[PDB]
């Protein structure tokens, strides 16, 4: 429901957008550059910018400005609020115990799957590797999950996008073969990824859905490749990851 | 700074954001209110403008923040500089250990991890650090610690009781203050199972070109494997070595 002009606080809208101004390209912002890149004036935006410094978001040598740490308390304090993560924690950790792997929940967040939830439990077995928290989709368990789930509209919007380039010296770069996997993923209803996106990285994922069958999140179990054969992570782990899924359907 | 060139709108803002928890998942604009000191009616701008922008959504009642707002952390992490200029050295520190490397900062009264090396490096039995510690009972937090003056060390145990994490977690502030100082002297610290039971951290500030504390440099080990004796013998040198390549900071 539209909001009033008068409700907005300016202020409010232009700082956002200007903390997410810094990139791996523009680390540092003087006024000028800030100004520009933004569209306010030079005036004004060093009043954003020295709010910024006074807050603890930034630091500046009196002519650059760069974030500080603190800009990661924003969105952590999503991490810790929101209500999919907080509500899939407990089977993350028991499913971490029941592995001895590293165990996420993966989610859409633009064009990559972001882990809002990855296991704590610190019993992992010798030889292991995580994910980390922000994961290209065409070549993880968690992404054709979800590539999978779309229908060939989006998928192709993706494609287009993003062109398949190779990560590792496994990775799929052919379409075609990729969309036979992905078809594969909705026909068996899971998806094994064996160091496409990391050498050493082998990953087993399942969806997880609602109670109209739409994907909320994937669930994954990363393992080494150097410790268990692809047979192996078929018969131990995905059993269990069927178990979690049906214990977390009253969740939904 | 002047305060004329302080754009309330973003402060409170940016300190409404934090408010949403785990423990305060949601909030209403009372909730909102009573939590940051604001009015009902400045906090329900406050929450509809995050709204139009896209950090929020809402039910006309209960506020609750986006995936958004990862973006704004977001930012620190393709951007900060720190990070980058050290990762090269603590992926070297945790191939020649094979143990967890960590570069630590503080942050608020926590110490955050900027640097953790891959969980691949390391074989064996161990235990990882989170991204974000308490300082009274960590390495790197007593590292931080004694590099304040007096004054700043009073006021963060003004605001923290020295709370057990395990059985073995020092409570006793004058204990814990002639370690700090032993900390300052020594150039090191090892902490033994006082934040985790098993986990035995060794660290080393890292300074900065005036001599001030910029970050901690820590190799977290387990101690079923490794005596203090060893960590000490072992590791250390590998870590004032590690502090030496790190001089052009
Ligand atoms: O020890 C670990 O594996 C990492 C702890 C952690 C928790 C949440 C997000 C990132 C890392």
Same mark, same amino acid.
């Given at each position: ?16 957008? %200007? ?39 930034? /630091?500046?040598?009196?002519?650059? !400005? *760069? ?78 999950? *979800?590539?999978? *789930? ?7 919007? !993706? ?12 990775? %799929?770069?052919?379409?075609?073969? %990729?969309?036979? /996997? ?13 160091? /496409? !996106? ?33 047979? /192996?992570?078929?018969?131990? !782990? %995905? ?14």
């Amino acid at each position: 429901p539209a909001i009033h002009p008068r409700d907005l606080i300016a202020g409010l809208q232009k700082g956002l957008a %200007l903390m997410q101004l810094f990139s791996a390209e523009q680390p540092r912002l003087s006024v000028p550059q800030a100004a520009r890149l933004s569209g306010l004036t030079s005036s004004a935006v060093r009043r954003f910018l020295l709010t910024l410094v006074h807050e603890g978001f930034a /630091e500046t040598d009196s002519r650059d !400005y *760069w974030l500080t740490p603190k800009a990661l308390r924003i969105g952590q304090a999503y991490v810790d609020s929101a209500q999919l993560p907080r509500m899939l924690r407990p089977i993350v950790e028991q499913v971490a115990r029941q592995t001895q792997e590293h165990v996420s929940v993966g989610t859409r967040d633009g064009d990559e799957i972001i882990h809002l939830v990855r296991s704590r439990y610190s019993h992992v077995a010798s030889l292991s590797i995580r994910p980390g928290s922000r994961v290209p989709m065409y070549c993880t368990a968690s992404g054709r999950i *979800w590539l999978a *789930w779309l229908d060939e509209g989006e998928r192709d919007e !993706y494609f287009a996008r993003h062109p398949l380039r190779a990560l590792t010296p496994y990775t %799929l770069t052919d379409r075609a073969q %990729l969309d036979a /996997e992905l078809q594969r993923v909705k026909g068996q209803g899971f998806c094994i990824v064996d160091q /496409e !996106y990391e050498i050493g990285m082998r990953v087993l994922g399942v969806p997880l859905l609602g109670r109209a069958g739409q994907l909320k999140a994937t669930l994954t179990i990363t393992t080494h490749a150097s410790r268990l054969s692809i047979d /192996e992570i078929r018969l131990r !782990y %995905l059993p269990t990851l069927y178990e979690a899924q049906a214990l977390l359907r009253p969740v939904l």
